[PDB]
Amino acid sequence: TCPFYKKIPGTGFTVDAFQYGVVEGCTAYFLTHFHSDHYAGLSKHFTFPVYCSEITGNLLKNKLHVQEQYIHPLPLDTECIVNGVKVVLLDANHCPGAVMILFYLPNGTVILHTGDFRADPSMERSLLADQKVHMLYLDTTYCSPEYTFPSQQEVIRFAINTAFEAVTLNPHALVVCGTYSIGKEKVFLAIADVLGSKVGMSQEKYKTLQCLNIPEINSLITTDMCSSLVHLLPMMQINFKGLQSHLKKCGGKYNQILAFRPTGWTHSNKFTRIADVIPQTKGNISIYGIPYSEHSSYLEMKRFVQWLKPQKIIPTVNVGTWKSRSTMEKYFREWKLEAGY
Ligand code: NI
C-alpha cells in the first residue's frame, strides 16, 4: 500500500509510487527521475498516465518499453494544466531529467515536491521566487551536520588533474570509471575530454546515454573499446580482481589501470580534504573513491529551506526509524527558530 508521503492531498496525484499496484483514486502518476528506487514497478504493461520530463520519458520508452500512449512529457519552467490542476516542473540539479514539481491546489495551498535534489542558490531565482509554499516534501538524504563534501566543480578538477598527470607520465595507462545508474556523467566525460579520447562502454550503457539529450554526444562516447582510453564498467567490477580481469582483455595495449569510484558521502570526508585524497593500490592498479554527490549537503539543504520558509516539511528519505525521524524534526525546528519563520 502507498505510503502517505507519496500522495498529494486534494488531487488525484501520486509521486514515485509505481510499486504498489493500482493506487486507489490515482488519476495521474508523476515520476521525478529515472532511478530504480523511484521507478520500481513500471513496465510495457503499465496502463495509466505518467507525467515526467522529456528525458525521463525517453528512458521509459526505450529502456522500460512503456507504451508511447501513456507517456506525458512536460517542458520545464512552464505552467501546465494536468487533470484540472496547475503544475510546474523545475530542474532538480540531480541526474539528467530529474525534476522538482510545484502543485497549485484548487483550495489555494501550494506544495513543492523536491524529488531527489542538490540544493543550489540558483534555485532562489527560479519560478519559486514569486510566491509562498505551504508544504515541502523534502529530499532529506543528508540531513545531518556531519554530512559535508566539496562542490562538484572541485571534485571534477581533482579527477581531471589526477588522470591527466597519470597518463602523461605513462601513455600506456588505462583509465576506468564505475557507474550503476544515470547521473555523474561529468566524471567520465571530463576525464575523456582532457585526454582527447571518447568514452568506451557496453551497448546497454551507450543506449541509456543516447536517451539523455547531451549536446554533441556522438562526439564523446562509443561502443568500440579498442579505440578508447577511458572505459566505463559496472560499479561492482571496480575492485582489484575485476580490474585485473579487465586488463587481461585489453590484449597488451596497457600496463597500468587508474580507476575512479564516484560514491556519495563516505566517513573519510570527516578527516580528509579533496586535495589530500589518496588511492588504494595493488601492483599496477590504483582506485580512487571520489565524493561526487547529486544530493544536498546539510548546509545546502539548510540554506534552501531557510530561504523557502515553508509552513510544514514532510521528509521523503530516512523515514523508516524513530531515531531518524526525531533527528530531522529537531533540525527543522532549529532552522525555523534561527531564521524567524
Ligand atoms: Ni535519485
Curated annotation (Swiss-Prot):
Subcellular location: Nucleus
UniProt tissue specificity: Expressed in brain, heart, kidney, liver, pancreas, placenta and skeletal muscle.
Induction remarks: During mitosis. The mRNA encoding this protein contains an internal ribosome entry site (IRES) in its 5'-UTR. This 5'-UTR generally suppresses translation while specifically promoting expression during mitosis, when cap-dependent translation may be impaired.
Disulphide linkage map: none
Result when mutating H295A: Impaired nuclear focus formation, reduced interaction with PIAS and increased sensitivity to cisplatin
Self-association and partners: Binds constitutively to TP53BP1. Binds CDC27, which is itself a component of the anaphase promoting complex (APC). Binds PIAS1.
Stated family: Belongs to the DNA repair metallo-beta-lactamase (DRMBL) family.
Role summary: May be required for DNA interstrand cross-link repair. Also required for checkpoint mediated cell cycle arrest in early prophase in response to mitotic spindle poisons. Possesses beta-lactamase activity, catalyzing the hydrolysis of penicillin G and nitrocefin. Exhibits no activity towards other beta-lactam antibiotic classes including cephalosporins (cefotaxime) and carbapenems (imipenem).
Name of the protein in its database record: DNA cross-link repair 1A protein
Full-protein residues shown: 700 to 1040 of 1040
